[PDB]
Paper text:
Prokaryotic ImGPS enzymes (including the ImGPS from T. maritima) form heterodimeric bienzyme complexes that consist of the cyclase HisF and the glutaminase HisH subunit, which supplies ammonia by glutamine hydrolysis. The active site of HisF is located at the C-terminal face of the central β-barrel, where two conserved aspartate residues, D11 and D130, catalyze the cyclase reaction. Based on the conformation of the loop that connects strand β1 with helix α1 (loop1), these structures can be separated into an open conformation, where loop1 is flipped toward the outer α-helical barrel ring, a detached conformation, where loop1 is not visible in the electron density and presumably flexible and a closed conformation, where loop1 closes over the active site.
To assess whether the mutations have an influence on the conformation of loop1 we determined the structures of the HisF-G20P and HisF-F23A variants by X-ray crystallography. However, whereas loop1 primarily samples the open conformation in the HisF-G20P variant, the loop1 population shifts toward the highly flexible detached conformation in the HisF-F23A variant. Whereas the G20P and F23A substitutions decrease the kcat of wt-HisF by several orders of magnitude, the F38A substitution has no effect on the steady-state catalytic parameters. Instead, the G20P and F23A substitutions likely influence turnover via alterations in the closed conformation of loop1. The HisF-G20P and HisF-F23A variants on the other hand interact with the substrate via a one step binding mechanism as loop1 is, in those cases, unable to close properly over the substrate.
Numbering used by the authors: 2 to 252
Amino acid sequence: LAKRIIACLDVKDGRVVKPTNFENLRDSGDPVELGKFYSEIGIDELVFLDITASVEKRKTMLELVEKVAEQIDIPFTVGGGIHDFETASELILRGADKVSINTAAVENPSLITQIAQTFGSQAVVVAIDAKRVDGEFMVFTYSGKKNTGILLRDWVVEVEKRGAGEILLTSIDRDGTKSGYDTEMIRFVRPLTTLPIIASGGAGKMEHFLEAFLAGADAALAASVFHFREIDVRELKEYLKKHGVNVRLEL
């Protein structure tokens, strides 16, 4: 499939938490205005990752989903502390195209199947945060803090068996840096699954996206490099097309 460029919007209390250099926007912290902007400059999909306190998280994420869905016409995923079927179902019914589950999927893998059978596998993204531990890629839950003891090579296979539609694969080893995506990890996972793999963590330069796609990623996710205009979406897509990557150009 043609590769996708995905913008990640970290949100809390209904607002974007990261700064941007988009001076043409009224309120860069409004996730709806910023998501609509990204959808108009060539981003293929959005991911919203919420870190609101649990007491207000449910209503905050539902309010976000409905306001985003009514203004944007590209697919979006919502995630961050989705712990059960009822929560995932409510977010999809409110307008989210896809939900991302991570900790809850590890602790109850059948949850993947329950959501996929109700709403289709396309509605289910399993986010996998992985790190090298003692010579093996290991799966971490709770925002990258808990070593589950589950090997990445086993979990990727299980996630597909359970009905996930996509894997959002973050390298804890590269996340927050601009050194490059973890192409070793992406290549390692690639033959273990037929599912789309979204590369996440490490983006710094246009060549990094090319390398991630040559490693087998189906999509590449980034945040601050887009927000700060360290990478321009149109320039990136033109660069990828010139180097032989099949990208979506319906800007």
